[PDB]
Design a binder for this molecule. Structure first.
Ligand SMILES: [Mg+2]
Ligand SMILES: [Mg+2]
Ligand SMILES: [Mg+2]
Ligand SMILES: [Mg+2]
Ligand SMILES: [Mg+2]
Ligand SMILES: [Mg+2]
Ligand SMILES: [Mg+2]
Ligand SMILES: [Mg+2]
Ligand SMILES: [Mg+2]
Ligand SMILES: [Mg+2]
Ligand SMILES: [Mg+2]
Ligand SMILES: [Mg+2]
Ligand SMILES: [Mg+2]
Ligand SMILES: [Mg+2]
Ligand SMILES: [Mg+2]
Ligand SMILES: [Mg+2]
Ligand SMILES: [Mg+2]
Ligand SMILES: [Mg+2]
Ligand SMILES: [Mg+2]
Ligand SMILES: [Mg+2]
Ligand SMILES: [Mg+2]
Ligand SMILES: [Mg+2]
Ligand SMILES: [Mg+2]
Ligand SMILES: [Mg+2]
Ligand SMILES: [Mg+2]
Ligand SMILES: [Mg+2]
Ligand SMILES: [Mg+2]
Ligand SMILES: [Mg+2]
Ligand SMILES: [Mg+2]
Ligand SMILES: [Mg+2]
Ligand SMILES: [Mg+2]
Ligand SMILES: [Mg+2]
Ligand SMILES: [Mg+2]
Ligand SMILES: [Mg+2]
Ligand SMILES: [Mg+2]
Ligand SMILES: [Mg+2]
Ligand SMILES: [Mg+2]
Lengths: 66, 204, 85, 79, 87
RNA sequence: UCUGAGAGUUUGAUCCUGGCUCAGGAUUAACGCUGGCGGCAUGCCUAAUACAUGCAAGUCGAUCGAAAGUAGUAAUACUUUAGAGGCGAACGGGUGAGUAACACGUAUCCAAUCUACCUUAUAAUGGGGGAUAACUAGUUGAAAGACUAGCUAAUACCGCAUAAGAACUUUGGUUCGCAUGAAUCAAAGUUGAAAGGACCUGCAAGGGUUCGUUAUUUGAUGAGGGUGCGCCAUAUCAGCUAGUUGGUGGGGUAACGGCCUACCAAGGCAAUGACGUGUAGCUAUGCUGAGAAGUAGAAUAGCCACAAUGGGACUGAGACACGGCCCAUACUCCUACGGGAGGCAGCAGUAGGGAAUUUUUCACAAUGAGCGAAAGCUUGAUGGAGCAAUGCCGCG
RNA sequence: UGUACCAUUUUGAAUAAGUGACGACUAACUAUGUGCCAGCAGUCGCGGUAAUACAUAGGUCGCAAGCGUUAUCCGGAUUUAUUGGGCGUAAAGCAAGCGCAGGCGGAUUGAAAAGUCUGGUGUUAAAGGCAGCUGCUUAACAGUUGUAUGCAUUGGAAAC
């Protein structure tokens, strides 16, 4: 929303990003890629959740299997 | 709010609720840590943090407490005069639901909590609705009445087996107590004093 | 009678090159907030030589505050011990 | 967006301004005339007008005091 | 225009008053000059632990009570000393 | 009588210097998953961005004329209020934009000040005059209104008589002071007040209580000024200041003061940091720390500042006035195209910004305020109830 | 506000459990799948076909109507060290000298009392801080009494 351009890693297996989309970034710092210091919170807005996940779901954003 | 697998946690630590009813059982006389990974090597040499946390759970699982309640009670007793190693033992043993099971009017501790929560108990001159009231030796915690006729009073009225620190006075159900519990009535299930320093680090 | 007493300040004259003025300087030994050591300060108050007091430069002068005679002038000269310079 | 008390208060103070402005002007013309052709007679009229305004509040009471003292200083110097 | 009056410092569903000498234009629960004594709407008896000392100075000085404030003075009897000291 | 826990990580392995990370608390918190309830407290940190709509300061007929309504044959009785007048609207509520300095905290001197109502005490509250609201009529308009001419009332306004005491000077004494200077007289000169209302008694005359008024006296509260000390970063900001420094006479301010004025001078501050830049409301306090202290100035409470932006002034004891007035700028809206209306940083709420923060709620019932004798009246302050696991605590 | 609460009032376990982690720091491990691919990660670092670090499953642990992640502040950090660090070889002694202002500084006597110490008084608003007590079923919370810190003035002490 500001005027700063940051390279942000998509934390998960599979993405719905289509070059033009909206994401809700959070804090972090992946050690493998130099320069990346942010993470996209998964399953909040336009970005979809991470299905096919039953472990540590609260972080990736997947509806409780129930 | 409690676990429904008291056998599992009692079997791991090794100490039951002081009658071994949850350890003897009717099957297999199992004295191993639960799960598939119970019969392995690497048994001793738990780190000080490791043994302290296991022991800390023992104290707070013997009485049905949430850790946050523990931090509150420790903060209360900590500041006063000095080496208060005689007060917090009385404070930890002053729980209302703890006294009713030790009163001999309940088959189990957490069953007594249900009777306490359901309003079947009266304090000295008032009623009880919350199973956390801090008691002081001298209050005539007289038993209720509409509960002396329920189909479960049989083992309740068998309070002849009672700890010396409680003058139950059955029949009249005066329900008083005095002579605070010595370490003898607090068996080796949880008998240690470095848990205070563990909470001293965690709680200011 | 009972009359509230004014504050006093002890200083030394630094210069006098106007009409009726004397720019005095008063020192103090305020402690330091952290290193706790006395520090000598210098601040230059002004006063008026109305008369009978003269108090030329180099004159050790006592100072008593007064009602503001003008901007930046709120003090008056008094008894002079060690009259020199 | 308007209060009857405020509107009424505005309408009254216009009339009050008219009367008070006249009274202040009365004091002004008398003192200029006085100091013009200096004469102990006029001084009195100055006293009457200055004191009357001070009681009504139109003029600050201190102003009546300072004007009174300074006009008497001129007479003593000139007499 | 000092006025001995109250100031609420309780909680929801539990008021708690203190007799206190304060100016009219000062907010309620604000600044005051001198403390007289506290009050409790549900203390059953002795509901108004009065001071009986500075209160007489301020009333003689010209302190203005309130309707409920005056009321408190009468059951203890503070109105009597004030009116007889005036006489 | 205070009072302190460590570990991982450079090397084939070791010791040391040294940086990074973790174990603990905390918040005005947000997001993901999940979700039952109760007792307390908190809840636009961003756009001091713009605002639909509805409420947020009125009161007194026991100040006054008139009008209207209800009863009454009438005389009149009761009720109501557009307007004149008194009082309050400067309190209370909100926000932190601006502000690096007497703004603030602390200690002070006001021989350099004010204070309406209030406290105590002390003299009066007599008698006249001229006006205008409401109303009527006319012009101009859909209306808001506006203009013109007559008619009235008073606790509205303006004279007059009168000063116990006041205020201004004069005469010499007193006691003196901290330099200017105050303090007290005795005599004199000069100047100067107002209004009645309600009720009772009395054939009347007259008398009386109470409210209110003028002139004073005591204090107190509140406001204002000056001063010492404390109170951010930066020298990769070294000169700044021409009403700036001082005197004289005068003017002005509640008061001292280049606050202002005319003249005479050339000073003042500055390496012990001026000036400039950037930043910020300050404080009591909140979180953290064994301590020294670090950190944020939630809530609430003190002080200051602000009310679309920038200026000016009236009324008043007190304003240069959040929901008073005048002017300019910007913005929006209405119109019958001539003219006007507007200020949610008051309670909700809307749009927008944001990762994100709530009822377009009820009652003055308690507390508090303003007016009133009371009846009362007004109170989005306040007290409740919604909303939200936002935090602490408790129970399932 | 028919609100808190109360009663032998009907029915009835009926209306109610999630989240993080399990290689070490740090309490808690096995199988299946994948095969430097897909992915994890606060730090060391795991994955190249036998992965207790990934995915899935079982078990287990730390919490609980809350649990994790992110942001900010403090501590740990003696890691700006007055209390409380260093400058030969690890960061750090200017290339050296003459040196004003500043800081420090021989011994003895006298006075003053600016520092220094002490007594009295005033003040440092209330809430908050700590202690005791009371009241809410105890608590959270509310009230209650106690509880300093500094500044100014005055009276003494005279070792530095
Ligand atoms: Mg002079
Ligand atoms: Mg005026
Ligand atoms: Mg290695
Ligand atoms: Mg940590
Ligand atoms: Mg009316
Ligand atoms: Mg205001
Ligand atoms: Mg408020
Ligand atoms: Mg705000
Ligand atoms: Mg700002
Ligand atoms: Mg008034
Ligand atoms: Mg008349
Ligand atoms: Mg006359
Ligand atoms: Mg009049
Ligand atoms: Mg001058
Ligand atoms: Mg420390
Ligand atoms: Mg605040
Ligand atoms: Mg704020
Ligand atoms: Mg407004
Ligand atoms: Mg207003
Ligand atoms: Mg609003
Ligand atoms: Mg605004
Ligand atoms: Mg009310
Ligand atoms: Mg909660
Ligand atoms: Mg709980
Ligand atoms: Mg994971
Ligand atoms: Mg795994
Ligand atoms: Mg640190
Ligand atoms: Mg440090
Ligand atoms: Mg070092
Ligand atoms: Mg080196
Ligand atoms: Mg060298
Ligand atoms: Mg070198
Ligand atoms: Mg040398
Ligand atoms: Mg030297
Ligand atoms: Mg020596
Ligand atoms: Mg205090
Ligand atoms: Mg409290």
């Amino acid at each position: 929303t500001n005027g700063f351009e940051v390279l942000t890693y998509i934390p998960g297996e599979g993405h719905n990003l289509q070059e033009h989309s909206v994401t809700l970034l959070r804090g972090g710092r992946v050690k493998d890629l130099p320069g990346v210091r942010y993470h996209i919170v998964r399953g909040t807005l336009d970005t979809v959740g991470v299905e096919k996940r039953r472990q540590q779901r609260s972080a990736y954003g997947a509806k409780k299997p129930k | 709010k409690y676990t429904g697998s008291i056998f599992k946690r009692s079997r791991r630590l090794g100490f039951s609720l002081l009658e071994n009813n949850k350890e003897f059982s009717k099957g297999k006389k199992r004295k191993t840590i639960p799960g598939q990974h119970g019969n392995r090597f690497r048994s001793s040499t738990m780190s000080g943090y490791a043994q302290q946390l296991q022991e800390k759970q023992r104290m707070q699982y013997m009485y049905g407490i949430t850790d946050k309640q523990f931090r509150r009670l420790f903060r209360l007793v900590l500041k006063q005069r000095g080496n208060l190693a005689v007060n917090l033992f009385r404070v930890l043993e002053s729980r209302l639901d703890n006294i009713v099971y030790r009163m001999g009017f309940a088959p189990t501790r957490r069953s007594a909590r249900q009777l306490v929560n359901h309003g079947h108990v009266l304090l000295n001159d008032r009623t009880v609705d919350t199973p956390s009231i801090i008691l002081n030796p001298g209050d005539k915690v007289r038993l209720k009445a509409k509960t002396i006729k329920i189909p479960i009073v049989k083992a309740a009225s068998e309070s002849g087996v009672v700890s010396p620190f409680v003058e139950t006075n059955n029949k009249t159900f005066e329900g008083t107590y005095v002579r605070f519990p010595e370490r003898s009535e607090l068996p080796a299930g949880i008998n240690e004093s470095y848990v205070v320093e563990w909470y001293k680090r965690l709680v200011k | 009678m009972k009359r509230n007493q004014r504050k006093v300040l002890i200083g030394i004259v630094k210069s006098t090159k106007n009409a009726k003025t004397a720019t005095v300087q008063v020192e103090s030994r305020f402690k330091h907030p952290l290193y706790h050591k006395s520090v000598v300060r210098h601040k230059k108050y002004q006063a008026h030589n109305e008369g009978e007091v003269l108090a030329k430069d180099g004159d050790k002068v006592q100072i008593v505050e007064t009602r503001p005679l003008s901007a930046t002038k709120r003090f008056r000269i008094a008894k002079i011990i060690e009259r020199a310079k | 967006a308007n209060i009857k008390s405020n509107e009424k208060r505005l309408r009254q103070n216009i009339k009050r301004n008219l009367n008070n402005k006249g009274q202040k002007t009365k004091l002004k013309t008398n003192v200029k005339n006085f100091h013009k052709e200096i004469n102990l007679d006029n001084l009195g009229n100055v006293y009457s007008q200055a004191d009357r305004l001070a009681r009504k509040g139109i003029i600050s009471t201190n102003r009546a005091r300072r004007l009174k003292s300074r006009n008497v200083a001129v007479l003593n110097k000139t007499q | 225009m000092v006025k001995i009056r109250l100031m609420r410092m309780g909680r929801v569903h539990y008021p708690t008053y203190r007799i206190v000498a304060v100016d009219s234009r000062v907010k309620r629960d604000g600044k005051y000059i001198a403390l007289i004594g506290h009050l409790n709407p549900a203390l059953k008896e002795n509901k108004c632990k009065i001071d009986e000392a500075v209160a007489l100075e301020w009333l003689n000085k010209g302190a203005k009570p309130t309707d409920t404030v005056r009321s408190l003075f009468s059951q203890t009897g503070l109105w009597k000393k004030f009116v007889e000291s005036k006489k």
